[PDB]
């Protein structure tokens, strides 16, 4: 998750706090996951062979 | 009280709205609280908690 | 606020909430993902 986020405390009631989201530091960049293309292709090929 | 006019600062007479048995009605009740159990809300010294 | 998926993913939101005393409501605000809020009416201003 590339970006830093800032928290905020809001008093729900007696001794209760609700941590909400304040803002995003810097330009917004979407989160993502990286998987090696060759390794994943090999794994999918193997499971395809087994399914065949 | 009459004796106060004559450590009476140790207590305060606090009146607040209390919910009755019906959730849509409130009753202005009163009670006496020790000053050690209440703190001011503002700096105006009229409203406590 | 985005430079320009992640642009519409979030929403400013202002609401009222109970304080530590259950007779006073305080106007607060926060940032909510659009996946966590559902529009109430069709005018696109009130959510929940």
């Amino acid at each position, epitope marked *: 998750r590339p970006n830093n986020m800032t928290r905020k405390s809001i008093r729900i009631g007696p001794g209760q706090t609700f941590y909400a989201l304040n803002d995003i530091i810097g330009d917004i960049r979407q989160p993502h996951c990286n998987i090696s293309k060759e390794k994943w292709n090999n794994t999918l090929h193997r499971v395809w062979k087994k399914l065949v | 009280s009459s004796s106060h006019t004559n450590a009476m600062q140790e207590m305060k007479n606090c009146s607040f709205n209390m919910t009755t048995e019906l959730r849509d009605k409130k009753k202005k009740v009163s009670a006496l609280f020790y000053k050690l159990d209440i703190v001011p809300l503002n*700096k105006n*010294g009229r409203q406590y908690r | 606020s985005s430079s320009h998926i992640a642009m519409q993913e979030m929403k400013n939101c202002s609401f009222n909430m109970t304080t530590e005393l259950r007779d006073k409501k305080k106007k607060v605000s926060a940032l909510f993902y659009k996946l966590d809020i559902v529009p109430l009416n069709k005018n696109g201003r009130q959510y929940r």
Partner: antibody
Amino acid sequence: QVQLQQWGEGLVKPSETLSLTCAVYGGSISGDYYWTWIRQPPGMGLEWIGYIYGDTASTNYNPSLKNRVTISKDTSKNQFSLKLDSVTAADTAVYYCARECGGQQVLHDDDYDFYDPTIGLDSWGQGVVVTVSS
Amino acid sequence: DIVMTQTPLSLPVTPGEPASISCRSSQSLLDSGDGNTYLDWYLQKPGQSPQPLIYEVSNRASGVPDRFSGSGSDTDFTLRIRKVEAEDVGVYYCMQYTHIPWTFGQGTKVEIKR
């Protein structure tokens, strides 16, 4: 918000009394508002002078000037004024009258009794230049 | 009296880049009476009355663009401008009103860098 139009005498002799007035338009001076006076010395940062509460007559002043400042309000004319006695050259500044929304606005026929708008000094006057010179 | 330290005292920023102003207090600003952190941010544009920017740490004022946004817990507070524009030049003050007297910061003079 509220329009605050202020006037007064911008030129006072040393050891005299500075009298400024701030008029409130578009709102009521009686309420849960802290009517504040703030001055900015030429070239320096802002400095807080004091305030007078809207509902009661509770006033708070800067401890450095607590023995000279007196802030009063006139609900009939919807105005509040500042009086500063024994002025010196250190009292030359630009004086702004502001309004700080309090945190216990009274709510009528609602589920709650009070309401905290989470608002500070939302209204500011245009400022009055005050020069303490003989 | 709470002493309110603002850093930097001068912030030259070119439009398009983020800017950050930090403000610290000698005491915790968490009001004990009602639990509100009373810290405000104000912007005094050149030759104009101060105007509200942020109320109570994070609650943005009315009419203030989305780029301005404050934060901080009880003693370290930060005002961030996501994308500085040529109309953001001015002096920024952090004011506390938890304790009497209300004390402003030194004031950060935001200017244009060339």
